[model samples]
Structures are given as structure tokens and as C-alpha cells.
Target chain A: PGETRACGRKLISLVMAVCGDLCNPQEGKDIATECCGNQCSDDYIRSACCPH
Target chain B: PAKIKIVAPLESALIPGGETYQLRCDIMSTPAATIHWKFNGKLIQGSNELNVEEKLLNFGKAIVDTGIVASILTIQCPSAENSGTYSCVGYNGHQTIETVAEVEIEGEASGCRSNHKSAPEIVFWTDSRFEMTGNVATLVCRANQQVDWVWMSNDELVKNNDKFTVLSNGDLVIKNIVWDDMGTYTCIARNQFGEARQETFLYPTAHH
Candidate 1:
């Protein structure tokens, strides 16, 4: 399930990152803090999170 | 009500193709439990790639007296295709317990090589300095040809263990966040051709 969660978080983070300011501030509580921390670089995100 | 408890959980193994790795899942419960093994979240049945051993602890007393039971899943000669997560789940009437582990196969030395004795070079997709702090972090390296890999932190060899998983694909995974983990991590890939090295620094939490 961690793989699933990591992937799920990757998607959520990706969407959130791309939609940063466009994201509704009214429902901002739903976003996980660290998941959108903007700490990843290039392909580094591939390893930092579980893919399998 | 039956409650299942996993006594022994499977641990990850570093395996070379052609050798079998033993995965044992031990369970203790008030009532007999049903065990199911899944690879990558899918049910697994016996095949040339796997063998199953199911047994009850003190079989005579297991059902009436209550005790431990175990399901042993043996992976035979797992290839690159078999690489993934494996989980053993046990369920009783009312409760369930499970454990999971990753089985990785190291790439075997291959005769395939570049014609020239070229030095190995490691490159990341970013082409920019990447910083990782106290969170799970990953780094991938690529080389022109197959090469043996070694990881270094602070210019010293980094030991392989559960804390750090180096994949057959030349990727590094650092699990969990620890402040002391900050350092320059280097991946060195070497072959009969030559060797190359590269390093990146970890960001201090203060930057955040």
C-alpha cells in the first residue's frame, strides 16, 4: 500500500505543484504539507518515493 | 473472535538471479487463519518462479488449542521481471494482519561492453544541483554501459541496508528523515572500461 500511497501522493503533488496558485485557497487544507514542499528535483522524485 | 498477529515478518533480500530466497510469514491467532500471498498486490499461485510451503504450528492443537501458523513462500531464481513488492496477508474471522518486503535482484556482470575502454560517466536528468533534506529522497544515475555501482557519503563508502536501498537501475533511495543524514552523496559506476563519479549535497533543514 505504501507504493500505492507514494504514487497517489506523487500524482496529488504533481497536480498541486502545477496548479500552485491556481489551487483554491478555500480548500487548501486537503493538500498534504510535505507532499507539496517543492523539495524534489528532476528525476530525484522517482527514487525519493516508492514506485513499486 | 479470532485475532491474527504476525510473529515473524518477511525482510527484504538482496538476491542474485538463479538463487532462491526464503520468505516466511509466521502468525499467531485464537482461531485458524487463512493465508494469502500476493506479488505486487495480486494473488500468487505456484509456478516455476515460486514454491509454497504451508504448515500449522502444532497442527493437532492449532485449531482447538490455538497457536501459531506459518506460510512460507519461496521465490526461485527471481529475474528482473520478478522485481517488485511481495506481501503475505493473514485473515481470521474478525481480524487481519499482513507483512510485506521488497526482493531485489542484482544485475549480473555481462560480457556486453563498448568497443573502446571509455570511462563511465553518471548523469542525472535534472542537470542541476538537487538538494534533499530530512525526507525520503532519491537519485538516479545513468551510464553508457553496464557498470558496478558504489555509493559514498561525505567521500566515504555508504553501506547498503534497509535505511538505504540501491536499486539495480542505479537509483538510490534514502528512507525516513534524519538530520544527520545530510552530506554529499556520490555514485561511482565502474566497469572494465573505466570509472566515473558524481556528487550532490543534501540541504540543511534550515533552508526551509
Candidate 2:
């Protein structure tokens, strides 16, 4: 039940910007790294609490 | 010796309130698998007349249909009052594998309280910035004195699915905020004293 992990979750916007409706997995991971410490798992606090 | 086998689709899943969510626990043994059920982790109490299924083993409900635990539990509106992790624990000769199926109200579910001191239980926050880069947001606000788990907009409820998104920590998260998002968010906490709702105005940052 970890939902607090969203370093890249905020990057949800960045991914949308770079790919412009396309899929750029790296861009998402790159932006998310800023908050999540190189991974969304590191930033989003909610995702780390819930196991779903 | 052989043990009991309880095969459920999932350890937990979502269910509609007032509706009967049946637990089909079958066993793969020589004869058959006989396992009892609990609602919230407590033994259900009822007579043949109390349960709609008319079978003690087969549970049902007419209201709060309180059991806190059982093979089949029922929630009228499935509000915060009827929110919790429902488990189906099976016991055999030796091997014991217990599976819990969480049947919670769509959104955040908590009892309603008027105390404001200990009411709300679910809090949602935004990045507080439009072009936010990396800012930590927290949403763990519970009822102040109300003690309810539901946040209301006008008279309608925000506990239903889609109204909010919750992380795995039992906290409810609301999606994109809008002008309409600014309003009185209420929590409903139900206890032995009954249900109480504490309403508060959550003014989201317009510029953020």
C-alpha cells in the first residue's frame, strides 16, 4: 500500500511535454529523478506506503 | 495430514455497498474443504432470519449488518463507516493460509465526527506551483472534530471512485484541482456514538 512515491508523478507533466503525446520512457525517468532520487520510487511518498 | 485450501480471486477487491459480495472458498482435497469466514476479522453474529442468505455459514446483511468480519459482510452505502480490510481466513488440519479481501468504499472512508478535534482522516494536497519541479506534497488530513473519513462537496459525496485517488498508505488523493475543487470537504466518522461529519473549507491555491 505505497502511494506516496511520485517524484516523477509530478513529472507527469514533463513526459507529456517532451514526447508531445509520444512515449519517451527515458524522459519520464529523467525528470522523475529530480525528486525521486533517480527514480519515481524515491520521491513519491504515497507509492512507497501502499503495495498495490 | 492435509490442510485447508482457500482460493479467492484476490486477497482483496472492491465491492458495492448494500450489495452481497460472496466469498467462494473452495478446497482441493479428497472430500471437501470446510472453512469459516470473518467480516472485518471478527466472528459474525446472526440468526437464520437476520441473514438474507438464511445460512449462518452464508452471511448477509440488512444494514450496518455489523460483523466487522465474516464470510459475507454488507454495507448500506459503503461509506467510511463500512470501510476496512475484509479477510477470509481458512483453517484446515495443519496448513493455514489466510487471505484478506479489502472491501472498502470507493473514496476515503472514515466515521463522521463533530468534535473537529479528531474528525478528518484524509488529506489531499497539490504541488502548490503551476510549473512545479520537485516539491514534496502531503495529504494526510483527517477530521478535526468530526471523525468522518468522507469529504463532501455540497450534499453529494467525494468518496466514490474517480472523485479521488489514494496511494497505498490508506490516504486518499484528489486528481487535478479546479475552481469547483474549492469548497467544504467533510469527513464522516462513525463509532459506537453514531456518525458525525466535520466539514472544512479547503481553499486550493488559485495561482499555484
Candidate 3:
């Protein structure tokens, strides 16, 4: 559980770094929550900022 | 007789992030020529991300007497680090010629930010002086920040006409170019902070 939380935090940071203010804060938090249990694919991370 | 000419030289281009781009240089010489490509003024080596190809054209003459050589440099999945000047150098027994173009890859995080706001700074550009008629020509002018763009040709305001189109990212494209389009083209970028301008010449030649 601790390792999963750490990965989620790092991925959130990566998303913020790549997308900057263009990414919504709530959306980033939601993505982190969703990916906390399961690993996110590269394509998933890239498309996280875009609305489906 | 030995004479070398860069028939189709490379032009500066703005490439979106993660897209593949190819730079071509075509040289015509009476005695043929040996060609090489360079990136950022340094010789490039073969890599999975970078591919280089060279071909010789005989123009219906004997294969042993080829007079034209074409060099193509391809870059795959280009990011911000791929932005630089690419050059194609050719040398015949009589002379040597080098054609260069600057490339800028957009939409990548540069990882450097400052609290101080500044004016739009022109970053990458190249004067296109060897485009051929009936070919499309793109002149690239990239700025450091988002800014409004205006293009001028020979002191006349260049609007979006049937022949010229200014891209949103500050690139000027001319379609089906003609000899009358040869002149000095200028790109100006401005925001609330300040403005910057760059001038490049376009000299279109008749297609051979």
C-alpha cells in the first residue's frame, strides 16, 4: 500500500511537470487516485489530461 | 569541368513534438560529389532515432557518370532536444558547398522557467534562398513565448492569400511558389512585454 501511494505521488508530479498549469488540480488528484491501485500505462499517462 | 550547386537546400522547419521529420539536400555537380550530414555543426552518427540516406542520380546518363547526389536526414520522434541546425556538406574536386537549416520542436517542457516576464525572443530561423518554382516553401520563425505573428514580404503586408498562409505557430508557408515571390520576408512576433523581428530572403529558381 505504501509503495503504491509513493508511485501515485510520483506520477502526479510527473503529470504536473509535463502538463504544467494546463492540467486541472482535481483531475490530477483523480488520476492519482485511479492509478494508485493499478499501474498506469504510458499512453494512459499521456492521455490523462485530455477529456475522453 | 567541375561545378557544384545545391539545387534543393534544406529550409528551416517547425516540427511538433514527437513527430518524424526529414531534411533533404540535393546537389548537382558535373564531376559528382561526396556528401555528409551534420547536426548542430557536428557530424552525425547512425542511431535508431536518426537515419541518413544518400542516393546518386544519373539523369539518363551512364551510371558511372552520375552528376546529382541527394542526402536525406530523418529524425524520428523528435523532442525539444532535437532542435538545432542541420547541415549537408558536399565537396567536388573543384569546390565545396554547405546548406544548413534550423529546426525547432514545439510543445515540450523545457524545464527552465523564470519568475521574470520578458519579451518574445526569436529563437530559430534560416534564410531560404534556394527554393524552386512550383514547390512549396516554408519559412520558420519560432519565438520563446506565445506571441502574435505578422509577416511581411518586401515591405508589403502578407495576408492569408491564395498563395501565402501564416501558421498559428509563426511559420510562413507559400504554396505553388513563383519567381515573383522572390524577395526579403520578415517575421515579427509581439506580446505585451515586447516585440522581436527577423528577416529572411527567398530566392526561387526555375525548376530544372
Best by lDDT: 3
Q: How would you encode candidate 1's per-residue C-alpha lDDT over B1-208 as one tens digit per residue?
A: 3445676588888788656566766555434345667899887732111001111212232122123344556565556767889988876556777799998878642442323466655532111112234345454455546888888866567778877877665656665434455445677889887887765333223223
CA lDDT of every candidate: 0.50, 0.35, 0.61
**What tens-digit string does per-residue lDDT give for candidate 2 at B2-116?**
3233323345667554443444433221111223445677744221111112123223311111001112333334556556665544443344556666766665434433233
User: Model 3, which residues run further than 4 Å from truth?
Assistant: A1-52, B1-115
Give the candidate number with the greatest TM-score: 3
In candidate 3, the residue pairs with backbone N, CA or C atoms under 3 Å apart (3 or more residues apart, or in different chains) clash, namely none
Looking at model 1 chain B, which ten-residue stretch has the lowest summed lDDT?
A: B46-55
Candidate 1 residues A1-52, lDDT tens each?
A: 2222232333343333334455553333334234234333323332233323
* Tens digits of per-residue lDDT for model 3, B27-73: 55434355677889897721111001111211332221122344456
Give the Cα error of residue B142 in candidate 3, in Å. Answer: 0.3
Candidate 2 chain B lowest-lDDT run of ten: B61-70
- What are the candidates' individual DockQ scores? 0.06, 0.07, 0.01
